[PDB]
């Protein structure tokens, strides 16, 4: 905000320092809290480490054990089965998953040799994307009047325009270059005046 934001506007920065969107919903998703929460759930970008409570690295048999937070796993709408499927698709190689509990499993790495590669595999696994639109770091559901609006910490106009239930004629952004590329130059100058 303030003078740095004004300088950002007048210097024509390609990407803002803090991107932001305001997302409106269609009439059938407009006045339901559960549907808005579902949309916010399925548009927010989530990694594996966002639902893992503890990570255990075993040197004796080259196994990595993952423990999942039940509350976070429910909040993100993620299940352990799809996490296993996502990990199976990775480049890791010949692995072997075994359940240790109803909320835990271990990757046994029947091939790896050293500890450097074991750790590299560990941070490769922890950074794997589970769901969400790229660029969206956090989504917040806000009640303005009788309507529910989604406030986003990131910016992706093309991605959000393809999401179901989004009102594409009312979507807002503070990224003027995306608005120029998608909507044209007159919309861009209207947005510039509004921002200033």
């Amino acid at each position: 905000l303030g003078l740095p934001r004004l300088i950002e506007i007048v210097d024509a920065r390609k990407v803002p320092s803090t991107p932001m969107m305001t997302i409106y919903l269609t009439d059938e998703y407009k006045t339901d809290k559960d549907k808005a929460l579902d949309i916010a759930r399925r548009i927010e970008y989530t990694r594996v480490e966002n639902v893992v409570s503890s990570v255990s690295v075993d040197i004796s048999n080259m196994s990595i054990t993952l423990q999942f937070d039940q509350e976070m796993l429910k909040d993100k709408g993620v299940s352990i089965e799809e996490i296993k499927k996502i990990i199976t698709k990775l480049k890791l190689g010949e692995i072997r998953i075994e359940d240790n509990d109803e909320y835990s499993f271990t990757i046994y790495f029947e091939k790896i040799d050293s500890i450097m590669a074991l750790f590299k595999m560990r941070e490769k696994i922890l950074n794997t994307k589970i769901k969400g639109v790229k660029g969206i770091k956090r989504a917040i559901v806000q009640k303005k009047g009788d309507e529910y609006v989604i406030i986003t910490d990131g910016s992706n106009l093309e991605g959000i325009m393809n999401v179901t239930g989004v009102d594409i004629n009312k979507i807002q952004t503070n990224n003027i270059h995306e608005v120029e590329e998608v909507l044209g130059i007159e919309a861009a100058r209207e947005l510039i005046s509004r921002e200033i």
Binding site: A40, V141, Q142, K144
Partner: protein, 92 residues
């Protein structure tokens, strides 16, 4: 964590034995070493910003100026709020 009684290097588990790679020592005792890291999700839940108080006048509401979700309900009939981060006064 164990060390070789002769070479002094650390011993790694191979099968049922712990073997020193430099001297070839072996033993019948097995000790398991793991490295456990914890991840905290105290403030990672999904926020729903309805101007409803939790304790006292502290409500959850998005500030139009800075964007923080902390507010003080100054007056209920006017829906008047005040940001706790930048002191901005607004209506929601």
């Amino acid at each position: 964590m164990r060390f070789c009684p002769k070479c002094g290097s650390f011993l790694k588990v191979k099968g049922n034995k712990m073997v020193c790679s430099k001297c070839g020592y072996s033993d019948h005792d097995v000790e398991k070493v793991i490295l456990k890291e914890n991840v905290a999700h105290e403030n990672d839940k999904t926020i729903i910003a309805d101007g409803e108080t939790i304790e006292g006048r502290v409500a959850i509401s998005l500030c139009p100026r800075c964007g923080s979700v902390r507010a003080i309900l100054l007056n209920k009939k006017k829906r008047l709020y005040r940001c706790m981060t930048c002191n901005f006064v607004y209506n929601i």
